[PDB]
């Protein structure tokens, strides 16, 4: 509350650290369904079903241009990528598995880096 603050967590490396995590996600061999926006003209259903499309390139641009106020807003867009994946893809599919794998991979790096 007013004039009463928890001790200041160092957040000065968060930008760089999220960038590294994002790089590692971009270079994972199962990143391919997630690298670019899903083509809304070419994938029937996507536009209507998926309210908030998200992909790694869009996260990369948002990061590089200061559109993430903090590391939680960044983690939310990353999770959104995998949540959309689950909404549109069967678990037993190449894309569906890639989603599960990438989410696991992300959540580990996230915990090891920040918790």
Outline the structure in words.
- The protein is mainly alpha-helical and 115 residues long.
- Helix content is 57%, strand content 0%.
- The longest helix is centred in the C-terminal third of the chain and has 21 residues.
Provide the number of structural domains. Answer: 1
- State the CATH class: Mainly Alpha
Strand content: under 5%
Order of helices and strands: HHHHH
Helix content: 55-70%
First and last CA, distance:
25 Å
CATH superfamily: Bromodomain-like
Class inferred from helices and paired strands:
mainly alpha
Number of helices: 5
User: Would you count the extended β strands for me?
Assistant: 0
The shape is elongated
CATH topology: Histone Acetyltransferase, Chain A
Largest sheet: none
Radius of gyration: 16 Å
Topology:
Elements: H1 14-26, H2 46-49, H3 56-64, H4 71-88, H5 94-114
Helix pairs in contact: 1-3, 4-5
Domain Bromo: 9-113
Subcellular location: Nucleus
Family: Belongs to the WAL family.
